[PDB]
Amino acid sequence: LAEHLLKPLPADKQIETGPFLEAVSHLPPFFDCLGSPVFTPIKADISGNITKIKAVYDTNPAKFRTLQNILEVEKEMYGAEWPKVGATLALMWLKRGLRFIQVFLQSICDGERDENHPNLIRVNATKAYEMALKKYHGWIVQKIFQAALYAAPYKSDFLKALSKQNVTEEECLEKIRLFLVNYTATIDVIYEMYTQMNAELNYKV
Ligand SMILES: CCCCCCCCCC
Ligand SMILES: CCCCCCCC
């Protein structure tokens, strides 16, 4: 995770598409080692979105040099169906999965815990879901997340699974904190871009 850091934001706060996709494509694999088949559809959604954006990018790397480029070009390209189309729509849902990972990881690092059951990650996962995904899910998908939550490893095993490696828990969390710097900054910029472009949508699934 400290092996595949996201680049820092350039001065103009424009995110290069190529480098961005490469960076985040290292994230899906971490779902395989949460030790449950329950997490496979979650991996699939994040991968699929990354793959959707990559495919739009590949058609014209220069036209789609930056994430901003993607949104402005596709807006012009699709008139009235935008923002509910193309790579704009893929990235709208990618950012939410990425924000989820962000909030979950920051929560853990901040020493947030259920005092009653302290070696679990339920409370961190629950917060991340509430902050990133919950308002865009109908009640059925919510009840599904609730169930999926019990497949979560212990905090202790999860951190041991990320050092996959001769390292203490505190060392491991320091590494995650370093990763969260440019990660958070980058996601914050993508979210800000959806707000300025008016490209954010609120439909539930
Ligand atoms: C570093 C990427 C790890 C992803 C965290 C996902 C945990 C999900 C619990 C529901
Ligand atoms: C460089 C991006 C390629 C698409 C990867 C799919 C997500 C694992």
Side-chain angles (χ1 to χ4, degrees), residues 96-124:
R96 298 175 179 169
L98 297 179
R99 176 77 94 69
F100 177 96
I101 294 164
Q102 172 200 307
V103 178
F104 172 77
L105 291 178
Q106 192 65 67
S107 181
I108 305 270
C109 290
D110 285 351
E112 293 167 17
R113 57 175 61 211
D114 183 1
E115 301 287 332
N116 309 302
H117 321 253
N119 198 25
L120 294 174
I121 51 182
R122 309 247 170 89
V123 78
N124 313 285

PDB file of all heavy atoms in Angstrom, residues 96-124:
ATOM      1  N   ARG A  96     -16.951   6.645  -5.146  1.00  0.00           N
ATOM      2  CA  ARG A  96     -17.685   6.212  -3.967  1.00  0.00           C
ATOM      3  C   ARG A  96     -17.079   4.966  -3.321  1.00  0.00           C
ATOM      4  O   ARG A  96     -17.014   4.869  -2.086  1.00  0.00           O
ATOM      5  CB  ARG A  96     -19.145   5.970  -4.333  1.00  0.00           C
ATOM      6  CG  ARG A  96     -19.838   7.216  -4.819  1.00  0.00           C
ATOM      7  CD  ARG A  96     -21.251   6.922  -5.285  1.00  0.00           C
ATOM      8  NE  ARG A  96     -21.912   8.143  -5.740  1.00  0.00           N
ATOM      9  CZ  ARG A  96     -23.074   8.209  -6.391  1.00  0.00           C
ATOM     10  NH1 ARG A  96     -23.739   7.112  -6.708  1.00  0.00           N
ATOM     11  NH2 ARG A  96     -23.570   9.392  -6.713  1.00  0.00           N
ATOM     12  N   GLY A  97     -16.617   4.025  -4.148  1.00  0.00           N
ATOM     13  CA  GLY A  97     -15.904   2.831  -3.659  1.00  0.00           C
ATOM     14  C   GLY A  97     -14.538   3.216  -3.115  1.00  0.00           C
ATOM     15  O   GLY A  97     -14.069   2.649  -2.124  1.00  0.00           O
ATOM     16  N   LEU A  98     -13.906   4.207  -3.739  1.00  0.00           N
ATOM     17  CA  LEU A  98     -12.614   4.677  -3.278  1.00  0.00           C
ATOM     18  C   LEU A  98     -12.745   5.478  -1.975  1.00  0.00           C
ATOM     19  O   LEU A  98     -11.962   5.266  -1.038  1.00  0.00           O
ATOM     20  CB  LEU A  98     -11.888   5.468  -4.364  1.00  0.00           C
ATOM     21  CG  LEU A  98     -11.492   4.753  -5.667  1.00  0.00           C
ATOM     22  CD1 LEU A  98     -10.815   5.716  -6.586  1.00  0.00           C
ATOM     23  CD2 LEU A  98     -10.595   3.537  -5.458  1.00  0.00           C
ATOM     24  N   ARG A  99     -13.738   6.367  -1.920  1.00  0.00           N
ATOM     25  CA  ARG A  99     -14.071   7.091  -0.689  1.00  0.00           C
ATOM     26  C   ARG A  99     -14.407   6.134   0.428  1.00  0.00           C
ATOM     27  O   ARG A  99     -14.072   6.366   1.577  1.00  0.00           O
ATOM     28  CB  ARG A  99     -15.248   8.048  -0.910  1.00  0.00           C
ATOM     29  CG  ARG A  99     -15.741   8.782   0.353  1.00  0.00           C
ATOM     30  CD  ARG A  99     -14.847   9.910   0.751  1.00  0.00           C
ATOM     31  NE  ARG A  99     -15.289  11.200   0.201  1.00  0.00           N
ATOM     32  CZ  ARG A  99     -16.431  11.806   0.627  1.00  0.00           C
ATOM     33  NH1 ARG A  99     -17.164  11.264   1.615  1.00  0.00           N
ATOM     34  NH2 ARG A  99     -16.861  12.962   0.112  1.00  0.00           N
ATOM     35  N   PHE A 100     -15.072   5.040   0.092  1.00  0.00           N
ATOM     36  CA  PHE A 100     -15.336   4.027   1.090  1.00  0.00           C
ATOM     37  C   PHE A 100     -14.034   3.490   1.656  1.00  0.00           C
ATOM     38  O   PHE A 100     -13.886   3.394   2.871  1.00  0.00           O
ATOM     39  CB  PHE A 100     -16.198   2.885   0.545  1.00  0.00           C
ATOM     40  CG  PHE A 100     -16.418   1.789   1.540  1.00  0.00           C
ATOM     41  CD1 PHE A 100     -17.564   1.768   2.319  1.00  0.00           C
ATOM     42  CD2 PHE A 100     -15.435   0.809   1.749  1.00  0.00           C
ATOM     43  CE1 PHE A 100     -17.757   0.769   3.267  1.00  0.00           C
ATOM     44  CE2 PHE A 100     -15.614  -0.184   2.705  1.00  0.00           C
ATOM     45  CZ  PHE A 100     -16.789  -0.207   3.462  1.00  0.00           C
ATOM     46  N   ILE A 101     -13.095   3.126   0.788  1.00  0.00           N
ATOM     47  CA  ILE A 101     -11.833   2.548   1.245  1.00  0.00           C
ATOM     48  C   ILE A 101     -11.086   3.577   2.096  1.00  0.00           C
ATOM     49  O   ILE A 101     -10.547   3.252   3.167  1.00  0.00           O
ATOM     50  CB  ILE A 101     -10.982   2.035   0.061  1.00  0.00           C
ATOM     51  CG1 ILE A 101     -11.668   0.854  -0.631  1.00  0.00           C
ATOM     52  CG2 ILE A 101      -9.580   1.634   0.516  1.00  0.00           C
ATOM     53  CD1 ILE A 101     -11.092   0.533  -2.019  1.00  0.00           C
ATOM     54  N   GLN A 102     -11.081   4.822   1.621  1.00  0.00           N
ATOM     55  CA  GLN A 102     -10.503   5.921   2.348  1.00  0.00           C
ATOM     56  C   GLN A 102     -11.027   6.083   3.786  1.00  0.00           C
ATOM     57  O   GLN A 102     -10.242   6.128   4.729  1.00  0.00           O
ATOM     58  CB  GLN A 102     -10.763   7.205   1.590  1.00  0.00           C
ATOM     59  CG  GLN A 102     -10.369   8.424   2.353  1.00  0.00           C
ATOM     60  CD  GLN A 102     -11.052   9.634   1.828  1.00  0.00           C
ATOM     61  OE1 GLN A 102     -10.990   9.915   0.639  1.00  0.00           O
ATOM     62  NE2 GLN A 102     -11.717  10.367   2.705  1.00  0.00           N
ATOM     63  N   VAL A 103     -12.342   6.206   3.943  1.00  0.00           N
ATOM     64  CA  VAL A 103     -12.954   6.441   5.246  1.00  0.00           C
ATOM     65  C   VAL A 103     -12.692   5.227   6.170  1.00  0.00           C
ATOM     66  O   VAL A 103     -12.302   5.395   7.322  1.00  0.00           O
ATOM     67  CB  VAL A 103     -14.481   6.783   5.124  1.00  0.00           C
ATOM     68  CG1 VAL A 103     -15.111   6.967   6.487  1.00  0.00           C
ATOM     69  CG2 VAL A 103     -14.716   8.042   4.260  1.00  0.00           C
ATOM     70  N   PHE A 104     -12.856   4.014   5.644  1.00  0.00           N
ATOM     71  CA  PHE A 104     -12.592   2.798   6.406  1.00  0.00           C
ATOM     72  C   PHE A 104     -11.160   2.788   6.941  1.00  0.00           C
ATOM     73  O   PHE A 104     -10.932   2.527   8.126  1.00  0.00           O
ATOM     74  CB  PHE A 104     -12.855   1.567   5.540  1.00  0.00           C
ATOM     75  CG  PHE A 104     -12.430   0.259   6.172  1.00  0.00           C
ATOM     76  CD1 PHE A 104     -13.204  -0.335   7.177  1.00  0.00           C
ATOM     77  CD2 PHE A 104     -11.272  -0.393   5.738  1.00  0.00           C
ATOM     78  CE1 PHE A 104     -12.830  -1.540   7.750  1.00  0.00           C
ATOM     79  CE2 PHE A 104     -10.877  -1.610   6.307  1.00  0.00           C
ATOM     80  CZ  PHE A 104     -11.660  -2.184   7.324  1.00  0.00           C
ATOM     81  N   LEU A 105     -10.200   3.090   6.074  1.00  0.00           N
ATOM     82  CA  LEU A 105      -8.801   3.082   6.474  1.00  0.00           C
ATOM     83  C   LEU A 105      -8.428   4.209   7.457  1.00  0.00           C
ATOM     84  O   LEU A 105      -7.588   4.011   8.330  1.00  0.00           O
ATOM     85  CB  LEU A 105      -7.873   3.104   5.250  1.00  0.00           C
ATOM     86  CG  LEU A 105      -7.809   1.873   4.330  1.00  0.00           C
ATOM     87  CD1 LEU A 105      -6.845   2.131   3.147  1.00  0.00           C
ATOM     88  CD2 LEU A 105      -7.411   0.627   5.090  1.00  0.00           C
ATOM     89  N   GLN A 106      -9.030   5.382   7.297  1.00  0.00           N
ATOM     90  CA  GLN A 106      -8.749   6.506   8.176  1.00  0.00           C
ATOM     91  C   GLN A 106      -9.319   6.221   9.580  1.00  0.00           C
ATOM     92  O   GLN A 106      -8.622   6.352  10.579  1.00  0.00           O
ATOM     93  CB  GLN A 106      -9.298   7.797   7.569  1.00  0.00           C
ATOM     94  CG  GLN A 106      -8.818   9.088   8.232  1.00  0.00           C
ATOM     95  CD  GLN A 106      -7.317   9.341   8.077  1.00  0.00           C
ATOM     96  OE1 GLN A 106      -6.814   9.577   6.979  1.00  0.00           O
ATOM     97  NE2 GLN A 106      -6.605   9.293   9.185  1.00  0.00           N
ATOM     98  N   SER A 107     -10.574   5.789   9.626  1.00  0.00           N
ATOM     99  CA  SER A 107     -11.212   5.303  10.843  1.00  0.00           C
ATOM    100  C   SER A 107     -10.321   4.321  11.620  1.00  0.00           C
ATOM    101  O   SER A 107     -10.086   4.515  12.818  1.00  0.00           O
ATOM    102  CB  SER A 107     -12.552   4.654  10.500  1.00  0.00           C
ATOM    103  OG  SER A 107     -13.203   4.203  11.669  1.00  0.00           O
ATOM    104  N   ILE A 108      -9.830   3.277  10.948  1.00  0.00           N
ATOM    105  CA  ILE A 108      -8.945   2.299  11.589  1.00  0.00           C
ATOM    106  C   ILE A 108      -7.725   3.004  12.178  1.00  0.00           C
ATOM    107  O   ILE A 108      -7.454   2.884  13.372  1.00  0.00           O
ATOM    108  CB  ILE A 108      -8.452   1.198  10.608  1.00  0.00           C
ATOM    109  CG1 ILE A 108      -9.619   0.493   9.916  1.00  0.00           C
ATOM    110  CG2 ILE A 108      -7.501   0.197  11.320  1.00  0.00           C
ATOM    111  CD1 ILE A 108     -10.140  -0.698  10.639  1.00  0.00           C
ATOM    112  N   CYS A 109      -7.010   3.741  11.326  1.00  0.00           N
ATOM    113  CA  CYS A 109      -5.818   4.502  11.709  1.00  0.00           C
ATOM    114  C   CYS A 109      -6.055   5.496  12.862  1.00  0.00           C
ATOM    115  O   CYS A 109      -5.149   5.765  13.641  1.00  0.00           O
ATOM    116  CB  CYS A 109      -5.245   5.235  10.488  1.00  0.00           C
ATOM    117  SG  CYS A 109      -4.480   4.153   9.221  1.00  0.00           S
ATOM    118  N   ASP A 110      -7.269   6.042  12.955  1.00  0.00           N
ATOM    119  CA  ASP A 110      -7.622   7.024  13.994  1.00  0.00           C
ATOM    120  C   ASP A 110      -7.957   6.363  15.326  1.00  0.00           C
ATOM    121  O   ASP A 110      -8.307   7.044  16.291  1.00  0.00           O
ATOM    122  CB  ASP A 110      -8.806   7.883  13.551  1.00  0.00           C
ATOM    123  CG  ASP A 110      -8.431   8.908  12.519  1.00  0.00           C
ATOM    124  OD1 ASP A 110      -7.231   9.092  12.256  1.00  0.00           O
ATOM    125  OD2 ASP A 110      -9.344   9.545  11.971  1.00  0.00           O
ATOM    126  N   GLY A 111      -7.858   5.040  15.374  1.00  0.00           N
ATOM    127  CA  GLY A 111      -8.105   4.305  16.603  1.00  0.00           C
ATOM    128  C   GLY A 111      -9.560   4.349  17.017  1.00  0.00           C
ATOM    129  O   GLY A 111      -9.872   4.347  18.209  1.00  0.00           O
ATOM    130  N   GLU A 112     -10.454   4.413  16.029  1.00  0.00           N
ATOM    131  CA  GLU A 112     -11.887   4.271  16.285  1.00  0.00           C
ATOM    132  C   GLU A 112     -12.192   2.789  16.430  1.00  0.00           C
ATOM    133  O   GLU A 112     -11.715   1.959  15.656  1.00  0.00           O
ATOM    134  CB  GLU A 112     -12.736   4.915  15.189  1.00  0.00           C
ATOM    135  CG  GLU A 112     -12.622   6.427  15.125  1.00  0.00           C
ATOM    136  CD  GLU A 112     -13.222   7.021  13.852  1.00  0.00           C
ATOM    137  OE1 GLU A 112     -13.997   6.316  13.169  1.00  0.00           O
ATOM    138  OE2 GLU A 112     -12.926   8.195  13.539  1.00  0.00           O
ATOM    139  N   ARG A 113     -12.964   2.468  17.458  1.00  0.00           N
ATOM    140  CA  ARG A 113     -13.266   1.088  17.794  1.00  0.00           C
ATOM    141  C   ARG A 113     -14.559   1.000  18.593  1.00  0.00           C
ATOM    142  O   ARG A 113     -15.019   1.997  19.159  1.00  0.00           O
ATOM    143  CB  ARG A 113     -12.110   0.464  18.580  1.00  0.00           C
ATOM    144  CG  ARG A 113     -11.746   1.204  19.869  1.00  0.00           C
ATOM    145  CD  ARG A 113     -10.683   0.455  20.654  1.00  0.00           C
ATOM    146  NE  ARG A 113      -9.431   0.299  19.906  1.00  0.00           N
ATOM    147  CZ  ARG A 113      -8.595  -0.732  20.045  1.00  0.00           C
ATOM    148  NH1 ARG A 113      -8.879  -1.715  20.896  1.00  0.00           N
ATOM    149  NH2 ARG A 113      -7.475  -0.792  19.330  1.00  0.00           N
ATOM    150  N   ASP A 114     -15.151  -0.190  18.602  1.00  0.00           N
ATOM    151  CA  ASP A 114     -16.235  -0.516  19.517  1.00  0.00           C
ATOM    152  C   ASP A 114     -15.574  -1.000  20.801  1.00  0.00           C
ATOM    153  O   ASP A 114     -14.965  -2.071  20.813  1.00  0.00           O
ATOM    154  CB  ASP A 114     -17.121  -1.615  18.909  1.00  0.00           C
ATOM    155  CG  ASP A 114     -18.325  -1.975  19.780  1.00  0.00           C
ATOM    156  OD1 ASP A 114     -18.526  -1.377  20.862  1.00  0.00           O
ATOM    157  OD2 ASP A 114     -19.085  -2.877  19.366  1.00  0.00           O
ATOM    158  N   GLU A 115     -15.667  -0.205  21.868  1.00  0.00           N
ATOM    159  CA  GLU A 115     -15.040  -0.553  23.158  1.00  0.00           C
ATOM    160  C   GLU A 115     -15.462  -1.952  23.619  1.00  0.00           C
ATOM    161  O   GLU A 115     -14.649  -2.708  24.160  1.00  0.00           O
ATOM    162  CB  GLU A 115     -15.379   0.481  24.247  1.00  0.00           C
ATOM    163  CG  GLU A 115     -14.952   1.935  23.956  1.00  0.00           C
ATOM    164  CD  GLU A 115     -13.449   2.172  24.055  1.00  0.00           C
ATOM    165  OE1 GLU A 115     -12.766   1.459  24.827  1.00  0.00           O
ATOM    166  OE2 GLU A 115     -12.954   3.088  23.358  1.00  0.00           O
ATOM    167  N   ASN A 116     -16.731  -2.279  23.369  1.00  0.00           N
ATOM    168  CA  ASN A 116     -17.351  -3.571  23.722  1.00  0.00           C
ATOM    169  C   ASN A 116     -16.781  -4.787  22.959  1.00  0.00           C
ATOM    170  O   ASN A 116     -16.488  -5.830  23.562  1.00  0.00           O
ATOM    171  CB  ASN A 116     -18.880  -3.474  23.545  1.00  0.00           C
ATOM    172  CG  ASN A 116     -19.487  -2.254  24.263  1.00  0.00           C
ATOM    173  OD1 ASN A 116     -19.346  -2.095  25.481  1.00  0.00           O
ATOM    174  ND2 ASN A 116     -20.163  -1.393  23.503  1.00  0.00           N
ATOM    175  N   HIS A 117     -16.643  -4.646  21.641  1.00  0.00           N
ATOM    176  CA  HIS A 117     -15.957  -5.641  20.799  1.00  0.00           C
ATOM    177  C   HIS A 117     -14.820  -4.938  20.021  1.00  0.00           C
ATOM    178  O   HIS A 117     -15.033  -4.463  18.901  1.00  0.00           O
ATOM    179  CB  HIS A 117     -16.930  -6.313  19.822  1.00  0.00           C
ATOM    180  CG  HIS A 117     -18.282  -6.611  20.398  1.00  0.00           C
ATOM    181  ND1 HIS A 117     -18.693  -7.891  20.711  1.00  0.00           N
ATOM    182  CD2 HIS A 117     -19.330  -5.797  20.688  1.00  0.00           C
ATOM    183  CE1 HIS A 117     -19.929  -7.850  21.184  1.00  0.00           C
ATOM    184  NE2 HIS A 117     -20.337  -6.592  21.185  1.00  0.00           N
ATOM    185  N   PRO A 118     -13.620  -4.846  20.633  1.00  0.00           N
ATOM    186  CA  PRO A 118     -12.527  -3.970  20.166  1.00  0.00           C
ATOM    187  C   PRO A 118     -11.608  -4.477  19.043  1.00  0.00           C
ATOM    188  O   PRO A 118     -10.900  -3.664  18.431  1.00  0.00           O
ATOM    189  CB  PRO A 118     -11.705  -3.745  21.441  1.00  0.00           C
ATOM    190  CG  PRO A 118     -11.906  -5.003  22.245  1.00  0.00           C
ATOM    191  CD  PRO A 118     -13.259  -5.573  21.867  1.00  0.00           C
ATOM    192  N   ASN A 119     -11.590  -5.784  18.788  1.00  0.00           N
ATOM    193  CA  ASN A 119     -10.739  -6.338  17.726  1.00  0.00           C
ATOM    194  C   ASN A 119     -11.510  -6.586  16.419  1.00  0.00           C
ATOM    195  O   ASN A 119     -11.071  -7.321  15.535  1.00  0.00           O
ATOM    196  CB  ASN A 119     -10.029  -7.609  18.207  1.00  0.00           C
ATOM    197  CG  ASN A 119      -8.836  -7.987  17.337  1.00  0.00           C
ATOM    198  OD1 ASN A 119      -8.235  -7.138  16.669  1.00  0.00           O
ATOM    199  ND2 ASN A 119      -8.488  -9.273  17.341  1.00  0.00           N
ATOM    200  N   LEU A 120     -12.667  -5.951  16.305  1.00  0.00           N
ATOM    201  CA  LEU A 120     -13.483  -6.058  15.109  1.00  0.00           C
ATOM    202  C   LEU A 120     -13.332  -4.779  14.300  1.00  0.00           C
ATOM    203  O   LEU A 120     -12.848  -3.767  14.818  1.00  0.00           O
ATOM    204  CB  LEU A 120     -14.954  -6.312  15.477  1.00  0.00           C
ATOM    205  CG  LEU A 120     -15.317  -7.639  16.160  1.00  0.00           C
ATOM    206  CD1 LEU A 120     -16.769  -7.639  16.562  1.00  0.00           C
ATOM    207  CD2 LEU A 120     -15.035  -8.827  15.264  1.00  0.00           C
ATOM    208  N   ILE A 121     -13.733  -4.834  13.033  1.00  0.00           N
ATOM    209  CA  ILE A 121     -13.709  -3.655  12.165  1.00  0.00           C
ATOM    210  C   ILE A 121     -15.120  -3.241  11.737  1.00  0.00           C
ATOM    211  O   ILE A 121     -15.285  -2.467  10.794  1.00  0.00           O
ATOM    212  CB  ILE A 121     -12.780  -3.857  10.939  1.00  0.00           C
ATOM    213  CG1 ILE A 121     -13.104  -5.177  10.219  1.00  0.00           C
ATOM    214  CG2 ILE A 121     -11.309  -3.795  11.367  1.00  0.00           C
ATOM    215  CD1 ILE A 121     -12.211  -5.490   9.009  1.00  0.00           C
ATOM    216  N   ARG A 122     -16.128  -3.739  12.454  1.00  0.00           N
ATOM    217  CA  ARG A 122     -17.535  -3.474  12.125  1.00  0.00           C
ATOM    218  C   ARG A 122     -17.831  -1.979  12.145  1.00  0.00           C
ATOM    219  O   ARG A 122     -18.452  -1.450  11.224  1.00  0.00           O
ATOM    220  CB  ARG A 122     -18.486  -4.189  13.096  1.00  0.00           C
ATOM    221  CG  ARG A 122     -18.225  -5.676  13.281  1.00  0.00           C
ATOM    222  CD  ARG A 122     -19.345  -6.559  12.730  1.00  0.00           C
ATOM    223  NE  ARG A 122     -18.944  -7.968  12.726  1.00  0.00           N
ATOM    224  CZ  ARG A 122     -19.121  -8.817  13.744  1.00  0.00           C
ATOM    225  NH1 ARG A 122     -19.718  -8.417  14.868  1.00  0.00           N
ATOM    226  NH2 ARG A 122     -18.708 -10.082  13.631  1.00  0.00           N
ATOM    227  N   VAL A 123     -17.368  -1.303  13.194  1.00  0.00           N
ATOM    228  CA  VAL A 123     -17.675   0.109  13.404  1.00  0.00           C
ATOM    229  C   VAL A 123     -17.013   1.007  12.349  1.00  0.00           C
ATOM    230  O   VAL A 123     -17.566   2.045  11.979  1.00  0.00           O
ATOM    231  CB  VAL A 123     -17.355   0.555  14.881  1.00  0.00           C
ATOM    232  CG1 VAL A 123     -15.864   0.788  15.090  1.00  0.00           C
ATOM    233  CG2 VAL A 123     -18.161   1.792  15.272  1.00  0.00           C
ATOM    234  N   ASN A 124     -15.851   0.581  11.859  1.00  0.00           N
ATOM    235  CA  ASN A 124     -15.078   1.317  10.841  1.00  0.00           C
ATOM    236  C   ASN A 124     -15.675   1.162   9.452  1.00  0.00           C
ATOM    237  O   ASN A 124     -15.802   2.136   8.701  1.00  0.00           O
ATOM    238  CB  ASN A 124     -13.622   0.841  10.835  1.00  0.00           C
ATOM    239  CG  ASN A 124     -13.042   0.751  12.235  1.00  0.00           C
ATOM    240  OD1 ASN A 124     -12.716   1.766  12.856  1.00  0.00           O
ATOM    241  ND2 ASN A 124     -12.934  -0.462  12.745  1.00  0.00           N
TER     242      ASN A 124
END
